[PDB]
Curated annotation (Swiss-Prot), chain A:
This is Large ribosomal subunit protein uL30A. Gene3D superfamilies: Ribosomal protein L30, ferredoxin-like fold domain. Present with 101000 molecules/cell in log phase SD medium. There are 2 genes for uL30 in yeast. Keywords: Cytoplasm, Ribonucleoprotein, Ribosomal protein. It comes from Saccharomyces cerevisiae (strain ATCC 204508 / S288c) (Baker's yeast). Its main location: cytoplasm. One of its GO terms (cellular component) is cytosolic large ribosomal subunit.
Swiss-Prot record, chain C:
Belongs to the universal ribosomal protein uL4 family. The eukaryote-specific C-terminal extension harbors a nuclear import signal and delivers the ACL4-uL4/RPL4 complex to the pre-ribosome, triggering uL4 release from ACL4 and incorporation into the 60S ribosomal subunit. N-terminally acetylated by acetyltransferase NatA. Component of the large ribosomal subunit (LSU). Mature yeast ribosomes consist of a small (40S) and a large (60S) subunit. The 40S small subunit contains 1 molecule of ribosomal RNA (18S rRNA) and 33 different proteins (encoded by 57 genes). The large 60S subunit contains 3 rRNA molecules (25S, 5.8S and 5S rRNA) and 46 different proteins (encoded by 81 genes). uL4 is associated with the polypeptide exit tunnel. uL4 interacts with its chaperone ACL4 and the nuclear import receptor KAP104. It comes from Saccharomyces cerevisiae (strain ATCC 204508 / S288c) (Baker's yeast). Changing F23A: Leads to an inefficient release from ACL4 with a delayed assembly into the 60S subunit. There are 2 genes for uL4 in yeast. This is Large ribosomal subunit protein uL4A. The gene is RPL4A. It is found in: Cytoplasm; Nucleus.
Swiss-Prot record, chain E:
It is found in: Cytoplasm. The lineage of its organism: Eukaryota, Fungi, Dikarya, Ascomycota, Saccharomycotina. Component of the ribosome, a large ribonucleoprotein complex responsible for the synthesis of proteins in the cell. The small ribosomal subunit (SSU) binds messenger RNAs (mRNAs) and translates the encoded message by selecting cognate aminoacyl-transfer RNA (tRNA) molecules. The large subunit (LSU) contains the ribosomal catalytic site termed the peptidyl transferase center (PTC), which catalyzes the formation of peptide bonds, thereby polymerizing the amino acids delivered by tRNAs into a polypeptide chain. Belongs to the eukaryotic ribosomal protein eL21 family. Component of the large ribosomal subunit (LSU). Mature yeast ribosomes consist of a small (40S) and a large (60S) subunit. The 40S small subunit contains 1 molecule of ribosomal RNA (18S rRNA) and 33 different proteins (encoded by 57 genes). The large 60S subunit contains 3 rRNA molecules (25S, 5.8S and 5S rRNA) and 46 different proteins (encoded by 81 genes). There are 2 genes for eL21 in yeast. This is Large ribosomal subunit protein eL21A.
From Swiss-Prot, chain F:
PROSITE patterns: RIBOSOMAL_L18E. It holds the Pfam family Ribosomal_L18. PANTHER family: 60S RIBOSOMAL PROTEIN L18, LARGE RIBOSOMAL SUBUNIT PROTEIN EL18. It is found in: Cytoplasm. InterPro entries: Ribosomal_eL18, Ribosomal_eL18/eL18-A/B/_CS, Ribosomal_uL15/eL18, Ribosomal_uL15/eL18_sf. GO terms for cellular component: cytosol; cytosolic large ribosomal subunit. One of its GO terms (molecular function) is RNA binding. There are 2 genes for eL18 in yeast. The gene is RPL18A. Component of the ribosome, a large ribonucleoprotein complex responsible for the synthesis of proteins in the cell. The small ribosomal subunit (SSU) binds messenger RNAs (mRNAs) and translates the encoded message by selecting cognate aminoacyl-transfer RNA (tRNA) molecules. The large subunit (LSU) contains the ribosomal catalytic site termed the peptidyl transferase center (PTC), which catalyzes the formation of peptide bonds, thereby polymerizing the amino acids delivered by tRNAs into a polypeptide chain. This is Large ribosomal subunit protein eL18A. One of its GO terms (biological process) is cytoplasmic translation. Keywords: Cytoplasm, Isopeptide bond, Methylation, Ribonucleoprotein, Ribosomal protein, Ubl conjugation.
Length: 222, 156, 51, 148, 53, 185
RNA sequence: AAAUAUGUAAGAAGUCCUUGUUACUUAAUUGAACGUGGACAUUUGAAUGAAGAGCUUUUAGUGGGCCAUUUUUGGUAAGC
RNA sequence: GGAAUACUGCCAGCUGGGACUGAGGACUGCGACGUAAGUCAAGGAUGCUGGCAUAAUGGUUAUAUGCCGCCCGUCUUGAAACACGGACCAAGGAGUCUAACGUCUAUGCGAGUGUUUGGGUGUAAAACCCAUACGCGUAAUGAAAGUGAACGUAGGUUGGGGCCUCGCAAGAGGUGCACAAUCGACCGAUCCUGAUGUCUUCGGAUGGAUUUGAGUAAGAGCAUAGCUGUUGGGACCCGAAAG
RNA sequence: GAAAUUGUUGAAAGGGAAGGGCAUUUGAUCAGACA
């Protein structure tokens, strides 16, 4: 009987081909990320040269964390919370922005906090707290083979493929994002920076869209 | 019977431990602990005695001597976490120290090898101590926290 | 049995993401940016300091 | 048996399953069929439409067995021949020898038409036949012999 | 939308596919460059309290 | 706390083993769970659960209901499976041959199958002949022909048969059953 | 003439072609209804979610309620 | 003009002090470092040293100390209540049994089923055996006289597990029990039609109808037993004024 | 020959009740386990 080193070296070799593919991909993404990031920087500078104004395309991706406890919630916001999978306090998810999800975010503003996540906080959300849904069962993503197993259908064979398909709002974002179990964050470590959570951010509380400030919060909760 | 007895008994076969992965890597002492440095012993028999640091033994402990004829403290093992490394230092270039290892301290009154090793090491040190005045008396006197001493403040 | 956090476990960091090695070897978290000299037109500067 | 009864399970709970508010009293609805026209009427119509009032003729001293008329469909019929004798008769379906089935002797009073007997001729002696039952008997080349 | 989705179906497949006939919601808008040409920002401030009755 | 979107700790609601205590039925199950675990074959997974069903959900399949199913086009050489008892029907005069795998055959029913030169097989004999259930036709009896379902859904204008003991006129036929007394249902 | 609240629709139970049945209906093989035969697959027709969906039987307790924000009636008001 | 700096953000940059935890128990995975052989911090703690071998550690207990803690039972929107019962202790002390039943379940047998009124018999209130009947089921519908269930592969259509054929597979076609939806057919009632004939008033074929039935359309029952539920009974237990 | 309840003896606590929860000091008492 073979397979001793036989299909060991058929697999281990096949596993090198994939890590090869992943390495090759994650290198391109990094080029994508920073060239896209520099193009914007230089666009804001070119527009100021010509005397004009460059306006950033409004964000297509949003990260929502439920700020409010379980009880005394009116029914209509309470279902939206469920349909966004925030059923527990400090549990976040990603939501792609369209009018049809924008109205949802409107309904739940007093119970959540959300804003525009940076590549950094998405990377550090998935690496530390990312879990998949496989026959329900909430499996941790500790090896790229779990992801390819259930997301390979769409592309997406690596943990970073996931991360890419998320931040870019891919064609498959729905399947990519629903695959991720809702992130369960801890309470912030530096506290909330506010004396009362349940006013709006603008009002000196924590709720509603705080834009890029969602990162310092989420990082203290991750 | 008084009790029926089970339908199932545990296997009395005791299993094997999983193959653990913990390498024993070496202890890197803090930069303040360098041979020739004077130490303050914080605990044990010789607590509060000021003493000279010689060699770092394979069991992680430090090798010190008093010198014996100064403060009464012999060639001895001491734990690097019960000691205060001071700034004041003497050169150990003229002390041998190679002879001294863990086995040398196996339990297995004083053996004459020790009384002699104590004299060869201490004579080298005292040769050096006398170079810097009052260093000998410093080593003969015990350390104590006085009133108003704030360890988290004091330089050593 | 026990989840290991890639963000502090260099082993697990590398089991995912082989590109981590290249990244660190090439710095790349500190990548120094193209030094270019554009300056803003007067309009931008005038209306910025306007009232 | 009593040890499986749920009243063993209720021991220690104050109310025996009977509620603290509304208890277990003697006869809150009244007794028996009381109120079929008043407080219990919603249950009476729906679950018992037709309960109240009369219909039709009284018959004084009506003896059942005046009306005794057990009914047997062609659906069976042939079952009235023991199966050993039976199979012998199906093959050789004929006049000049055709099985005589006395249905009165079998405990039946009327032969109805449920359907489909094979084409074997039969002589069926009965007190009463449905019209279709007899037509079908004829279409197999048998007859009915009215008895009493 | 059915007889429209039938049109761009045939008129695409017979061309070699590339369809996209499901409806999408309002997307966030793209980036754009607004010119200052003939248009300089007109600076406004809050007005004081008046009465006029 | 979790805002619970569904009732927690809910049982599947489906029988898992038979509620029966019959060792042989337990053994038959033991067989077919194995078969259903290792065969990837639809027939075995279905047969497993049929063994769990109560006497109500195992209506008898008659020998004439069997004879019918073999008159389906291309069905005449298939072996019919009845997970449950099989009953005789004096109403068919010609029974085909076949091979019938059931839990039980009544005296009369097995006779009529064998008299025509058929075969009465126990379910385990059928597993050996057809592990993946090849060339099988499963028949279920008429579940809703119980006398009890007559009275289910009783109510106004439902046409549903009162729960009654003595019948005839004089029994629940007048007010509410006809336009001339009160109303009609 | 709002805001909030509310009915319906967002496909395979769909769409198009051909041309059968009738006692209804038409001036009329006209129509109406139900069809036989044929053409196009999942970017098959918005979003989000889905520890699945559907269904049947039987039976408990309950059938004094009270409170808060907002709307609001009677009362000067009320822990009415 | 040329720098610095703050502020905000990023680094898969390095590094120190402290705390809790150490689940698992051969191997199996994904990897990392090496020219290599090997090695590792990579699917959960090991190494080295010391002390006691004991009331040392631990359990129980009494007490002290910090913080906390109102009377139980009940009816109630609301009880610690300035609502009731209860001084204490033991021992009694309340959903039962029966008749007839609904849903469900187990079991026997199944178009049937039920030995136990009785008889036979007996190691004698048991066990074993049994003829005739009877009961319920196998026909329904009418107030009744009465009549009484296949146009047809026991129907058409739509969904339908399973199985069958083709295909490597994805798929496609074939057959389709249970069940569900829908249009029809059959029996009785009601209403209409009223042939052939006739003791000229009998007879009621035949074809129909927004009518109607607890029906037919390849039977599902009968019996024992159990929980729960129903009715009558002293009816879960104790309680009138009365008659 | 239980309990309520009582005498004696022994121990302990007690500034307008007592009793109770978590925790530890102290006293008393005790199991197991080393080899
Ligand atoms: Mg989401
Ligand atoms: Mg801080
Ligand atoms: Mg803090
Ligand atoms: Mg405050
Ligand atoms: Mg944290
Ligand atoms: Mg190792
Ligand atoms: Mg070190
Ligand atoms: Mg009972
Ligand atoms: Mg209970
Ligand atoms: Mg309770
Ligand atoms: Mg109850
Ligand atoms: Mg009570
Ligand atoms: Mg009440
Ligand atoms: Mg009556
Ligand atoms: Mg019946
Ligand atoms: Mg019936
Ligand atoms: Mg709406
Ligand atoms: Mg989903
Ligand atoms: Mg599911
Ligand atoms: Mg009720
Ligand atoms: Mg009620
Ligand atoms: Mg009322
Ligand atoms: Mg640290
Ligand atoms: Mg362990
Ligand atoms: Mg001890
Ligand atoms: Mg102790
Ligand atoms: Mg001991
Ligand atoms: Mg004491
Ligand atoms: Mg207190
Ligand atoms: Mg009150
Ligand atoms: Mg009071
Ligand atoms: Mg009272
Ligand atoms: Mg009292
Ligand atoms: Mg007692
Ligand atoms: Mg006797
Ligand atoms: Mg006998
Ligand atoms: Mg006799
Ligand atoms: Mg009868
Ligand atoms: Mg009759
Ligand atoms: Mg009296
Ligand atoms: Mg009186
Ligand atoms: Mg005595
Ligand atoms: Mg106590
Ligand atoms: Mg002992
Ligand atoms: Mg001991």
């Amino acid at each position: 009987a073979e397979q001793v080193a036989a299909e060991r070296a058929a697999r281990k070799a096949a596993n090198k081909e994939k890590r090869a593919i992943i390495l090759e991909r994650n290198a391109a993404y990094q080029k994508e990320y920073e060239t896209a990031e520099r193009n914007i920087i230089q666009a804001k500078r070119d527009a100021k040269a010509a005397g004009s104004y460059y306006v950033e395309a409004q964000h297509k991706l949003v990260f929502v964390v439920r700020i409010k406890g379980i009880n005394k919630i009116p029914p209509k916001p309470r279902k939206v919370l469920q349909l966004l999978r925030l059923t527990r306090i400090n549990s976040g998810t990603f939501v792609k922005v369209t009018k049809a999800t924008l109205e949802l975010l409107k309904l739940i503003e007093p119970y959540v906090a959300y804003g525009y996540p940076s590549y950094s906080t998405i990377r550090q959300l998935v690496y530390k707290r990312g879990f998949g849904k496989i026959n329900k069962q909430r499996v941790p993503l500790s090896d790229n083979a779990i992801i390819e197993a259930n997301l390979g259908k769409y592309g997406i064979l690596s943990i970073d493929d996931l991360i890419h398909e998320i931040i870019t709002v891919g064609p498959h974002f729905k399947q990519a994002n629903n695959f991720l179990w809702p992130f369960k964050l801890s309470n912030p470590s530096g506290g909330w920076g506010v004396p009362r959570k349940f006013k709006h951010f603008i009002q000196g509380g924590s709720f509603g869209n705080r834009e890029e400030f969602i990162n310092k919060l989420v990082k203290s909760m991750n | 019977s008084a009790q029926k007895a089970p339908k199932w008994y545990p296997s009395e076969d005791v299993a094997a431990l999983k193959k653990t992965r913990k390498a024993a890597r070496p202890q890197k002492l803090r930069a303040s602990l360098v041979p020739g440095t004077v130490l303050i012993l914080l605990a044990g028999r010789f607590r509060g005695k000021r003493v000279v640091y010689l060699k770092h033994l394979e069991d992680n402990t430090l090798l010190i001597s008093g010198p014996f004829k100064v403060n009464g403290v012999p060639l001895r093992r001491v734990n690097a976490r019960y000691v205060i490394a001071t700034s004041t230092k003497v050169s150990v270039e003229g002390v041998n120290v190679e002879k001294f290892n863990v086995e040398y301290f196996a339990k297995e009154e004083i053996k004459a090898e020790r009384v002699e090793d104590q004299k060869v090491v201490d004579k080298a040190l005292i040769a050096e101590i006398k170079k810097t005045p009052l260093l000998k008396q410093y080593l003969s006197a015990s350390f104590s926290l006085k009133n108003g001493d704030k360890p988290h403040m004091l330089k050593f | 049995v026990l989840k290991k956090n890639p963000l502090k476990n260099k082993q697990v960091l590398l089991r995912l993401n082989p590109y981590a090695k290249v990244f660190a070897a090439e710095k790349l978290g500190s990548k120094k940016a193209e030094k270019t000299g554009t300056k803003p037109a007067a309009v931008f500067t005038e209306t910025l300091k306007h009232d | 048996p009593s040890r499986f009864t749920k009243t063993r399970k209720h021991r220690g709970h104050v109310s025996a399953g009977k509620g603290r508010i509304g208890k277990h009293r003697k006869h809150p609805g009244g007794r028996g069929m009381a109120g079929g026209q008043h407080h219990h009427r919603i249950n009476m119509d729906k679950y018992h439409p037709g309960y109240f009032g009369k219909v039709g003729m009284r018959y004084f001293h009506k003896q059942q067995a005046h009306f005794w008329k057990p009914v047997l469909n062609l659906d069976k019929l042939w079952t009235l021949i023991p199966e050993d004798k039976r199979d012998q008769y199906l093959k050789s379906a004929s006049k000049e020898t055709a099985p005589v089935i006395d249905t009165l002797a079998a405990g039946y009073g009327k032969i109805l038409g449920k359907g489909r007997i094979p084409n074997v001729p039969v002589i069926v002696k009965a007190r009463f036949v449905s019209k279709l039952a007899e037509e079908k008997i004829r279409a197999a080349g048998g007859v009915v012999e009215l008895i009493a | 939308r059915v007889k429209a989705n039938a049109a761009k179906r045939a008129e695409a497949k017979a061309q070699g596919v590339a369809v996209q006939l499901k409806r999408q919601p309002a997307q966030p808008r793209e980036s754009r460059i607004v010119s200052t040409e003939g248009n300089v920002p007109q600076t406004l401030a809050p007005v004081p309290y008046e009465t006029f009755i | 706390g979790i805002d619970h979107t569904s009732k927690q700790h809910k049982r599947s609601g489906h029988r898992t083993a038979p509620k029966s205590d019959n060792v042989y039925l337990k053994l038959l199950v033991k067989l077919y769970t194995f078969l259903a675990r290792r065969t990837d074959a639809p027939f075995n997974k279905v047969v497993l659960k049929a063994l769990f069903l109560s006497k109500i959900n195992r209506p008898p399949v008659s020998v004439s209901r069997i004879a019918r199913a073999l008159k389906q086009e291309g069905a005449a050489n298939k072996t019919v499976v009845v997970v449950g008892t099989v009953t005789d029907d004096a109403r068919i005069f010609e029974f085909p041959k076949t091979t019938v795998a059931a839990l039980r055959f009544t005296a009369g029913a097995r006779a009529k199958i064998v008299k025509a030169g058929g075969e009465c097989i126990t379910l385990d004999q059928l597993a050996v002949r057809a592990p993946k259930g090849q060339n099988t036709l499963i028949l279920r009896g008429p579940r809703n022909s119980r006398e009890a379902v007559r009275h289910f859904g009783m109510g106004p204008h439902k046409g549903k048969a009162p729960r009654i003991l003595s019948t005839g006129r004089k029994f629940e036929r007048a007010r509410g059953r006809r336009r001339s007394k009160g109303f009609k249902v």
